[PDB]
Structures are given as C-alpha cells and as structure tokens.
Amino acid sequence: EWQGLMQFTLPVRLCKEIELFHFDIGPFENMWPGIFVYMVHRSCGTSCFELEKLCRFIMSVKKNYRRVPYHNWKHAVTVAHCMYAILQNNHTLFTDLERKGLLIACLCHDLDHRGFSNSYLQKFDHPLAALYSTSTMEQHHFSQTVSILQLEGHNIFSTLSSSEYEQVLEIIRKAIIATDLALYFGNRKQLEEMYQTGSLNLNNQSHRDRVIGLMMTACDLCSVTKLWPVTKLTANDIYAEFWAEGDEMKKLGIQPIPMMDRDKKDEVPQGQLGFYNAVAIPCYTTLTQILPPTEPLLKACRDNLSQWEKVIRGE
Ligand SMILES: COc1cn(-c2ccc(N3CCOC3=O)cc2F)nc(-c2ccnn2-c2ccccc2)c1=O
Numbered sequence: 001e002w003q004g005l006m007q008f009t010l011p012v013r014l015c016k017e018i019e020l021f022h023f024d025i026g027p028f029e030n031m032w033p034g035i036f037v038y039m040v041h042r043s044c045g046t047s048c049f050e051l052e053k054l055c056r057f058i059m060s061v062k063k064n065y066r067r068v069p070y071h072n073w074k075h076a077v078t079v080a081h082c083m084y085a086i087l088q089n090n091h092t093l094f095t096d097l098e099r100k101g102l103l104i105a106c107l108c109h110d111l112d113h114r115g116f117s118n119s120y121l122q123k124f125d126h127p128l129a130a131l132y133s134t135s136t137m138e139q140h141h142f143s144q145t146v147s148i149l150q151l152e153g154h155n156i157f158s159t160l161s162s163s164e165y166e167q168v169l170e171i172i173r174k175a176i177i178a179t180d181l182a183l184y185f186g187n188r189k190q191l192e193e194m195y196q197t198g199s200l201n202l203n204n205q206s207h208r209d210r211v212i213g214l215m216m217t218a219c220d221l222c223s224v225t226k227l228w229p230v231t232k233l234t235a236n237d238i239y240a241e242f243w244a245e246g247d248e249m250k251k252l253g254i255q256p257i258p259m260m261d262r263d264k265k266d267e268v269p270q271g272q273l274g275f276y277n278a279v280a281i282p283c284y285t286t287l288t289q290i291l292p293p294t295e296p297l298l299k300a301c302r303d304n305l306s307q308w309e310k311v312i313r314g315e
C-alpha cells in the first residue's frame with residue numbers, strides 16, 4: 001500500500017487550488033494520502049522525513065480511522081489541509097519543528113475515534129473514561145499517535161535530536177488536547193483579552209501554545225468554511241454521528257439531548273445558526289485578529305452563516 005503512495009504525483013490542475021482555504025478534498029478520495037505527502041513536502045521540504053517511513057506512517061494512520069459517519073479519514077485530511085493553508089499563509093511565524101508537528105497532529109487528531117463524545121464515555125464509565133478522566137478521546141488520540149510512531153519503520157522523527165524529539169511530541173500532545181472543544185472557550189477568551197490589552201507576545205511559549213490551540217480549533221471546525229454545497233453535506237455527516245450517539249442512549253430507554261435526537265431534526269438549521277454565532281464566528285474572528293492572512297476562513301464562515309439564516313427563513 002505505502003509503496004504506491006511513494007510514486008504519487010499530485011495532478012498539476014490542483015497545484016493552485018490546493019492553496020486556497022476553501023479547497024474541498026471531497027472529490028479526490030484515492031488521492032488523500034498523496035495530498036498529505038504533497039502538503040508535507042511543500043511546507044516542511046522533501047528532506048524533512050525519510051519518504052518510506054512517512055508513507056508507512058500515513059497508511060497506518062489511515063488504517064486507524066474507523067468507518068464512522070464524520071470522525072473518519074476524510075475528516076483527518078480535511079483538518080490537515082486547513083492547517084497547511086494557515087502555515088503557507090503565515091510563512092515567517094512558525095518554526096520548522098512546529099510546522100512538522102502541527103501537520104502530523106492534524107492528521108492524527110481524531111485517531112481511532114469511536115463516534116462518541118467524552119460526555120457519553122464518562123456517563124457510562126467506559127474504560128477510556130476510567131483511564132482518561134478529562135479530554136477523554138483526545139488523550140486516546142495522542143496515545144494512538146505515539147503507538148503508531150513506535151511501530152517498526154514508522155518513526156518519522158527518528159532523525160531528530162533526542163531533545164527535538166521530546167519537543168515535537170509535546171507540540172503534538174498540546175495540539176491534539178486543544179481539539180477538545182470544551183477547552184476552546186477558555187482559550188479563546190484568554191487570547192481575546194491578551195489581544196485587547198496588547199500583552200500577547202509570540203516570544204512567550206505559553207502564548208504560542210494558546211495560538212496553536214486556537215489554530216487547531218479553527219482547522220478542526222473548517223467544514224464551516226467551505227463553499228455552501230460542501231458545508232451543507234458535511235453537516236449531514238456531523239448529525240449522522242450525533243444521531244447515532246443518541247440512538248445508543250435510546251437503546252437503554254434514555255432520551256438524549258435534542259442535538260443528538262434524530263426526532264428533533266427540524267431544529268438543525270437553528271442549531272447551526274446558534275453554533276456559528278456561539279462558536280465558529282468567535283473562533284475565526286479571534287484567529288483573524290492574531291493572524292490576518294487567515295481572514296478568508298472568517299469570510300467563508302460568514303457566508304455559510306447567512307445560508308443557514310435563509311434556510312431558517314425558508315428562502
Ligand atoms: C450544533 O452544531 C454543532 C455542534 N458542535 C459541537 C461539538 C462538540 C461540542 N463539545 C464537545 C465537548 O465540549 C463541547 O462543547 C460542542 C459543539 F457545539 N460541533 C459542530 C461542528 C461543526 C464542525 N465541526 N463540528 C464538530 C466538532 C466536534 C465534534 C463534532 C462536530 C456543530 O456543527
């Protein structure tokens with residue numbers, strides 16, 4: 001499998017499109033692993049990883065995303081591509097180690113996702129929630145990332161100094177934990193206050209950590225920043241997964257919250273309008289304030305918000 005990946009060349013017709021924030025990987029399934037190699041090569045250089053190890057690694061990552069409706073291999077590559085666009089548009093800001101780490105973190109950030117929220121696992125005392133009390137799935141995702149790195153022939157970071165290795169692993173760990181949306185609200189609030197008071201300082205590692213955290217949220221949510229027909233279809237996948245979780249609760253006779261209740265699907269457009277206003281807009285707004293070149297994400301997010309309004313108003 002990984003051998004043919006090494007041979008892959010991205011078709012020229014996509015070399016410019018892939019650079020756009022709103023690029024949709026959807027029509028190109030067979031190319032997804034090749035697209036990740038492409039993005040790594042443009043962003044970190046072709047000398048960054050031993051090609052063979054990189055290819056084994058990517059195919060093992062792919063193998064460890066499950067066949068769930070949303071948190072799947074497609075989602076992984078979509079999030080990685082958004083991070084590619086951020087990094088490419090902010091060429092001076094991030095170190096080589098950060099760029100490598102963040103691309104890998106994005107590809108790995110939902111590894112072995114089961115289609116269940118942290119809340120669900122915690123409610124029912126799943127072994128994963130007994131192991132990881134908070135940010136439950138996110139600690140599992142990082143754990144899975146480390147397990148793949150430690151497979152024979154998969155250590156893409158083998159040629160880093162011992163110190164650079166622990167550094168990148170921490171970058172990756174913080175970045176994946178940051179994708180727990182419960183942590184986003186506090187992070188964005190801290191960042192906003194630091195901005196408005198002019199105390200945000202990118203020489204400060206804890207500030208850098210917070211910015212990266214916000215970048216991770218922005219990439220994770222980036223389905224809301226695609227062209228409307230793409231965003232609309234992705235909303236279908238998201239609720240399919242939400243509703244499957246609710247179905248699991250109904251199997252114990254338990255009524256789930258309305259977001260997870262397929263009998264409540266008439267509320268979806270209002271649910272989206274709420275989510276965009278409460279979560280997505282503030283996210284891309286703060287991101288754009290800190291990193292002005294990411295503005296196309298906010299613009300695209302606003303466009304989709306006005307689409308949901310039209311749906312609600314029956315236009
Ligand atoms: C109501 O519509 C939506 C609600 N959520 C949502 C999800 C989790 C939490 N959680 C988990 C822990 O703490 C939280 O607050 C709160 C949320 F609002 N996400 C999306 C969305 C749009 C794009 N990606 N995702 C997405 C993000 C994560 C998981 C699934 C989907 C969405 O469209």
Ligand SMILES: [Mg+2]
Nearest residue numbers: 109110179180
């Ligand atoms: Mg996740």
Ligand SMILES: [Zn+2]
Nearest residue numbers: 109110179220
């Ligand atoms: Zn995700």
